[PDB]
């Protein structure tokens, strides 16, 4: 699945990993994260993530 970078801190949202500590099971697509999900490291909004693909 896809990976997304937090353009603030460099955290990688890996869709394969999810973010279980913050309520997100492995395999959750970035688009499906709640609108108010934030980077677990720096707190940046979803707007601050870049999909890692051309
Ligand atoms: Fe971040």
Curated annotation (Swiss-Prot):
Binding-site residues for Fe cation, renumbered to this chain: 6, 9, 39, 42
Pfam families the UniProt entry points to: Rubredoxin
Protein's UniProt name: Rubredoxin
Name of the gene: rub
Spans traversing the lipid bilayer: none
Cofactor: Fe(3+)
Organism expressing this protein natively: Pyrococcus furiosus (strain ATCC 43587 / DSM 3638 / JCM 8422 / Vc1)
Biological process, per Gene Ontology: alkane catabolic process
Keywords tagged on the record: Electron transport, Iron, Metal-binding, Transport
Tree of life domain: Archaea
Biological role stated in the UniProt entry: Rubredoxin is a small nonheme, iron protein lacking acid-labile sulfide. Its single Fe, chelated to 4 Cys, functions as an electron acceptor and may also stabilize the conformation of the molecule.
